[PDB]
């Protein structure tokens, strides 16, 4: 009722805050288009956003948009994540492809977050298709990493004496067991910044070569992205350059009837 | 201040609501581990959740967890999306791989949502690497589809007289232009349910064959997933079965220095 209305309105205020942060402006008809609300309601939402931050935005009468002011500081922490729009879209017409992969375990994630926050020791049972028997492992983690769909923890392995990555869905048990020293400054790969230069794939026709350079805002046929050395492997996966242990276990399934399901594709 | 505290607490109430929906229970130490709050605060959060739905949960003194009651109905719409935990993790230690892909355009998404809601005509400029020149197109959409990272719109193409998929980042312009008739019941592929049977990949050793069947809860070495015919192609991408037009444009980049960046991988 009222709680459902205040909850729904709060997401629209986060939409406003997001649009101002990333696009620099918002139209009243953006709210009506996106959420299916009336023009009056969109006017109430904009007024409510202004009560939280009176100088975050300003109406431009000629253009008929609200623009982010010079003093704009986002009101909600959610505005900082680029993909938050995807979440707003998914929560407030929309359909999903079936996810084959395993579901993230909130208990294991919580223990790892605690251990990162407190620089703790954790004892895990890690089990992978590369070593099916699995084994217990002693880790000191210092970062939880999002790779599109997949999560992995960056941690110090103590028997092995090196910093490594561990896929969250391959962690079957996770227990906090002690307090450690901070090691983050010894993970050189994690801290070394690499300037990755991308160009349009050789072989593209002139037209698709110019399209891709326009789509990715390249200067002189080049694009620059800063990556930590310990994350290069994950960036290259997006370009489909490698294919191996650190990809999902879903890849290791197979269709019982590959002939019959292929016919059904159109 | 107070607004920041009520906003932060609301995410913890959504965590509670999510855990009850998906895991059936929540521990007080789950809140403290995940959010870094004090035990007293976690007690205040649980009490606040109970005020919204007094019978959604019940404390089990022996196990020391709050369990979802028989009458549990989620309090927040966000609890319905499995991947909402990933969003809570990303908003409230955490790092991200650089996203190479283009950012979702909220204006275009809003026009498409409006057209789906109102069964409208839309006029788009669609531009792809398969046809670089691009072209204007007349579409009547009826679903917005999430495929992990990627979005596409399922729509009726009128010059072509068929239902097709259109990647959202390849839509460069989108305008609502008219009102249409409802066509959803004529999209047979979208409405035809397919029972996809998956098995462990042939060739796996006995150990990794049993691991994967335990990980995906298979009965008799088999797994069943319902897919709409018009979504089979996207399910097969997760198994890496095809590789082509409907994958990201990012795949069509290349590393300027493939030798130097390969050395840096460890």
Residue numbers in the entry:
A (entry chain A), B (entry chain A): 16 to 107, 123 to 273, 276 to 298
Sentences from the study reporting this entry:
We show that CapW is a transcriptional repressor that binds the promoter region of its cognate CBASS operon to inhibit expression of CBASS genes. Our two structures suggest that ligand binding to the protein's WYL domain causes a conformational change in the WYL and WCX domains that triggers a large-scale rotation of the wHTH domains to release the protein from DNA.
We crystallized and determined a 2.3 Å resolution crystal structure of Pa CapW in a low-pH condition (pH 5.0). The symmetric arrangement of WYL domains linked by WCX domains is similar to Sm CapW, but in Pa CapW the WYL domains are each rotated ∼10° downward and inward toward the wHTH domains. This motion is accompanied by a slight widening of the groove between the WYL domains’ ligand-binding sites and bordered by the two WCX domains, and also by a rearrangement of the C-termini of each WCX domain. Finally, we observe that a salt bridge between a conserved arginine in the WYL domain and an aspartate on the WCX domain is broken in the Pa CapW structure, enabling the WCX domain to move out and away from the dimer-related WYL domain. In our structure of Pa CapW, the WYL domains pinch inward by ∼6 Å, positioning the equivalent tryptophan residues (Trp181) and the nearby α5 helices too close to one another to accommodate the α4 helices in their original configuration. This change, and the motion of the WYL domains in general, in turn cause a striking ∼70° rotation of each wHTH domain compared to its position in Sm CapW.
